[PDB]
Structure 1
Amino acid sequence: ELIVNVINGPNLGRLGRVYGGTTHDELVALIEREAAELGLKAVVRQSDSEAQLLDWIHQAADAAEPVILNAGGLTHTSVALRDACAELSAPLIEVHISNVHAREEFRRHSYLSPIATGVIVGLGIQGYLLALRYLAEHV
């Protein structure tokens, strides 16, 4: 179907001021533009609140919509986020802008990867665009 949810977690609202010079609004505009090219509709949301993130994931579970998720630090710490993402019946693509394996050791474990469909790391902001293209070819 058309709709794809792009969910960013804590601190991703500060993009542009490791993660590069593009701002979160620029990111939204890039995503929406690529999604229209692809025949999808992208709904892009960001929150520093875990409960707010869980609500958005819950809604994608009930609507059976795919999710492209950059959980930020919660990647490495939240079992609650993992359990909500485990209910999604449509694909889940875990995105990271930086290469989490070229940093601290503790960033090289994700609670999320074992239940995601796939993972894209280190490809910068284009990683989101590439995740979108995967989803457009997989319907």
Structure 2
Amino acid sequence: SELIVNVINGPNLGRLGRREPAVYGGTTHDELVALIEREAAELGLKAVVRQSDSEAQLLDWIHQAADAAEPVILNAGGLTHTSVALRNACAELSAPLIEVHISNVHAHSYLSPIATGVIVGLGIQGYLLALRYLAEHVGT
């Protein structure tokens, strides 16, 4: 069966493509969802791509990915340097966790120390590169 991958975007990402397109790119979150779904499907993956500004909703999704042993690509957005609850929930995942940021945040994520790996600064392509890693490192 095709590998289910959850792609979770946190606060601010709802404004992707609308807010500061000269910094984070012109692609909207809707277009990002479609691009990720297409590329995942090409790789034999099923991407479940969601955005929320609610910490509670993000935790809720992470908990389901934990129980289901499904990989997660997480861009915590505005919660990246603030939510300990996200860190704590992600610590319970039993499949890979790839943290992704569009911009190079380094120019102290709670998530990075507990993620499998991290991709930052590579734009929206970072999500696609994370998919390609998972396609090669998680089996069906």
Shorter-chain TM-score above 0.5: yes
Task: Give the deviation of 1:2 after TM superposition.
Answer: 0.9
TM-score, length-scaled by structure 1:
0.93
Q: Find the residue that maps to 1:100 and give its secondary structure.
A: coil
Task: Give the deviation of 1:64 after TM superposition.
Answer: 0.5
Q: Spell out, residue by residue over 1:93-132, the C-alpha distance to the aligned partner (whole angstroms, 9 max, x if none).
A: 0000001112xxxxxx010001000000000000000000
Q: Find the residue that maps to 1:111 and give its secondary structure.
A: coil
Q: Spell out, residue by residue over 1:6-57, the C-alpha distance to the aligned partner (whole angstroms, 9 max, x if none).
A: 00000101101x2110000100010000001100100001000000000000
TM-score, length-scaled by structure 2:
0.93
Alpha-carbon distance between aligned partners in 1 of 2:130 and 2:78, rounded to the nearest angstrom: 20
Q: Which runs of 4+ in 1 moved over 4 A?
A: none
Aligned pairs for 1:74-113 within 5 A: 74-102=79-107, 109-113=108-112
User: Considering only aligned residues, what root-mean-square deviation do their CA atoms show, in Å?
Assistant: 0.7
Number of residue equivalences: 132
Alpha-carbon distance between aligned partners in 2 of 1:42 and 1:31, rounded to the nearest angstrom: 7
Structure 1 unaligned residues grouped into runs of 5+: 103-108
Percent of matched pairs sharing the same residue: 99
Structure 2 unaligned residues grouped into runs of 5+: 18-22
